[PDB]
Amino acid sequence: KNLCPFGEVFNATRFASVYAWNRKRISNCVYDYSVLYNSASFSTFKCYGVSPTKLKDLCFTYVYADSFVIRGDEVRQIAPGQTGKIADYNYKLPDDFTGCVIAWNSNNLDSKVGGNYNYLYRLFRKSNLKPFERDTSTEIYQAGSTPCNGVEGFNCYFPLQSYGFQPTNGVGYQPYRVVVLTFELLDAPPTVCG
């Protein structure tokens, strides 16, 4: 087998909004992970269930590449056992997570002059998400007793709101691109190897 196509995930031109995060399982390939965990051009590199230097002597069945864009303040929430509007309503990691979280500042790519309104997040949900669930629905959230009948109004809000990503934003408010690698093993033979 030849390279795992991790480049086309890290180096994609368009990243997804956190509410509608993208995924791509990797299979039947080999990859050197030092090229990432020694990059230093990633502002964030945290692995939870595994040594990043042990990936080379470890094989797995699948590797999942979840990518999205959140706010700099919220990179804290992309971790096991975290709360907040991102970890509750947009992207949730299991407590028994085995993988690595990789993030970097994209203010120079995703911040626009009058604000970039393409990047959205979910501000309202009735139930907190389950691990690795994705809700892309646009249902008018009921914030009261009076139903909404599919119409936005009083206590009837559109559940998605936008990061107004501007290049003059504070660093905690700047856009950060995220790639979440999830290493999985089951009875299916391991095909993706370090």
Epitope: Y117, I140, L160
Partner: antibody, heavy 127, light 111 residues
Framework: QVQLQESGPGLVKPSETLSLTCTVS?????????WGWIRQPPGKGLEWIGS???????YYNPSLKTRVTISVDTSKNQFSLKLSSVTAADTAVYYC????????????????????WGQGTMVTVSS | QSALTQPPSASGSPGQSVTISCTGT?????????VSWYQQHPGKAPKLMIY???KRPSGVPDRFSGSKSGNTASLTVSGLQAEDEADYYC??????????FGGGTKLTVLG
């Protein structure tokens, strides 16, 4: 400092295609918002023609969908209006405008309220 | 004629309160809370005064207010000033018909 400016011929021979272009400055159309065209015949009311955002999706006035095309040129930051088979009833002041809402996926997006307007160019349909 | 009824003319006095009505159907003004109000002075572009039924853009004086009741929406202008004499249009989303406009109301200050 979002600004919109209309350009195009002030005269169009009947049954031929009207063509207008709206140049946007101070804000990239790719960044967000819906961009629409509204016309007004002399001494009459406002008629919304259609709206568009940077992907190319469009919503049109039902009384004009067979003759209206709205395009967008993001690399050159403008969006255009083509209206074919014109008559005297198409003689109007044509405005280009920007929607109030920057989010593109809101309900009725591009068919709600319009926030910044151009000064409006007038097209006369005559031989 | 137009998709939304709007009285052709409304006559208020200086400093008083004038209200313009806009009557649609259940498929437009009754159906949704996306009613917009525009001011147009002779020879200049329309100006947004009220959006989303009651919201007011910045700079618009708080003299101008909008509300909705059933299939009828209304814009109210209190403290009528001299430069309030203009044309006024209501707007609404109508589902299949998308954005539809009222015919417009002429407002003249009686002084």
């Amino acid at each position: 400092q979002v600004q919109l400016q209309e350009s195009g011929p002030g005269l169009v021979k009947p049954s031929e295609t009207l063509s207008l272009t709206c140049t946007v400055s101070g804000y990239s159309i790719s960044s967000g918002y819906y961009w629409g065209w509204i016309r007004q015949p002399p001494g009459k009311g406002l008629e919304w023609i259609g709206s568009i955002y940077h992907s190319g999706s469009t919503y049109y006035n039902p009384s004009l969908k067979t003759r209206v095309t709205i395009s967008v040129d993001t690399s050159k930051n403008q969006f255009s209006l083509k209206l074919s088979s014109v008559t005297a009833a198409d003689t109007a002041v044509y405005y280009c405008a920007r929607a109030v809402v920057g989010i593109v996926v809101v309900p009725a997006a591009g068919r709600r309220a319009f926030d910044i307007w151009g000064q409006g160019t007038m097209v006369t349909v005559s031989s | 004629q137009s998709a939304l009824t709007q009285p052709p003319s409304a006559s208020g006095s200086p400093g008083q309160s004038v209200t313009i009505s806009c009557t649609g159907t259940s498929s437009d003004v009754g159906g949704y809370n996306y009613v917009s109000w525009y001011q147009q002075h002779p020879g200049k572009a329309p100006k947004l005064m009220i959006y989303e039924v009651s919201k007011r853009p910045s700079g618009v004086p708080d003299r101008f207010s909008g509300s909705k009741s059933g299939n009828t929406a209304s814009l109210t202008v209190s403290g009528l000033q001299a430069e309030d004499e203009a044309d006024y249009y209501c707007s609404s989303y109508a589902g299949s018909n998308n954005l539809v406009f009222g015919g417009g109301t002429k407002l003249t200050v009686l002084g």
